[PDB]
């Protein structure tokens, strides 16, 4: 069985006057993530992990963060891989992410064609350290495992 | 073989009047890690990597005790009960001081004991942050972990 | 099948007067990474992911960062020695994935050169080696161009 690992990282600044969208869930908050796309740090980190596992390069090579994640899953499937699972962490000082985690997992699972039991998202703060601990930005990390057919 | 990956991250601030406990090892040092638990940054990241691979959420979603070895063992029991077995764990601790390398063996032996795994399936690595950022100024300590499971 | 995961992290400061070598690629730039060896952050993070998946400790356990032998060391030589220890311990490498994070210079145009070196060093085909490039969106020391971070993941199977 030809198993492959991938890992992803993303970070965006948080700014006034942008919606906060993470894992495709819009979360009520006075600030949101700055980027070219909707800046969805969590979907971007998972997309990178998936391309990384498939050795299809990265998000910048290929490319709604949902649309991108769905095109990523297509390209990975087309390259002959199946997705075993995704795990991820979002690091944000605020707001509270816990009540939105199930929604992110549902969006991710739909977009990757997986059952919910193969998708995990975890939330952390940065314990008031650094730009994350001060609310100036939000980070996501992801890991994915593929099997090549 | 139904293999699954998990990854974990944790960071705590260094403060006076706390012991420094990492990988269950008490490390002599003028400061220790701040949290509501014993703030064992390494055991927390590994615990999160293990729940993450089993798709059982995270430490937050779970476990009220301060002793992070008790939490790591309960983690292992939940993982086992969910039908998985652990292939291995690897991890990194980042601290500008003290030097962590002489303390790594003891963390390996604590984690191995708590997960019921032989030493050869348990790895801990030590890094500094090259005097960059809050880590590089000695203001806290970060750990990263990865774990692989097989659902049986 | 006895599969094992490894992960790696490294970060170095950018300073005047050093070459910039990442993934074994010399990149033209006014600053380079500072460390004991040539400070190749990406090879170091992959080297740590490889030792970590094989439970062989870490780069500092094998190549001391205060031993004169490794002052200015070409980090490809350490990567190749790491891969030989990992194979000798009974493992084959399934694949490596990695990310380099720098606000500057642009790293995306150099990814394919880094993959080529790493694949050659690990005795792997290109389709088992991946390197991704990111910026830090002007956040923190990485966002202000003060250093460059690398992250890696390696998957082994024990024979
Ligand atoms: Zn992004
Ligand atoms: Zn913690
Ligand atoms: Zn290094």
Numbering used by the authors:
A (entry chain A): 1 to 63, 74 to 159
B (entry chain C): 1 to 62, 70 to 159
C (entry chain B): 1 to 159
Publication excerpt:
2C-methyl-D-erythritol-2,4-cyclodiphosphate synthase (IspF) catalyzes the conversion of 4-diphosphocytidyl-2C-methyl-D-erythritol-2-phosphate to 2C-methyl-D-erythritol-2,4-cyclodiphosphate and cytidine monophosphate in production of isoprenoid-precursors via the methylerythritol phosphate biosynthetic pathway. IspF represents a potential target for development of broad-spectrum antimicrobial drugs since it is proven or inferred as essential in these pathogens and absent from mammals. In all IspF crystal structures three subunits form a compact bell-shaped assembly approximately 45 Å by 60 Å in the axial and equatorial dimensions respectively. The enzyme active site is located in a cleft at the interface of two subunits and here Zn2+ is coordinated by the side chains of two histidines and an aspartate.
Attempts to produce unliganded BcIspF crystals for ligand or fragment soaking experiments initially appeared to be successful and highly ordered samples were obtained. However, citrate was present in the best crystallization conditions and the electron density maps were consistent with this molecule coordinating the metal ion and therefore complicating ligand-binding studies. Citrate was well defined in one active site with an average B-factor of about 23 Å2, but less so in the other two where it was modeled with occupancy 0.75 and the average B-factors are approximately 37 and 43 Å2. For comparison, the average B-factor for protein atoms in this structure is approximately 19 Å2. The best-defined citrate binds to the active site Zn2+via both carboxylate and hydroxyl groups and this is also observed at one other site. Here the citrate forms hydrogen-bonding interactions with the main chain amides of His36 and Ser37, and side chains of Asp65 and Lys134. The interaction involving Asp65 is likely a consequence of the low pH at which crystals were obtained. The normally flexible and poorly ordered α2-α3 loop appears to lock down over the bound citrate adopting a configuration similar to that observed in the EcIspF-MEcPP complex. In the other citrate-binding pose (not shown) only a carboxylate coordinates to Zn2+ but hydrogen bonds are also formed exploiting the same functional groups on the protein, the amides of His36 and Ser37, Ser37 OG, and Lys134 NZ. It is clear from these results, that any attempts to investigate ligand binding at the Zn2+ site will require crystallization conditions that do not include citrate.
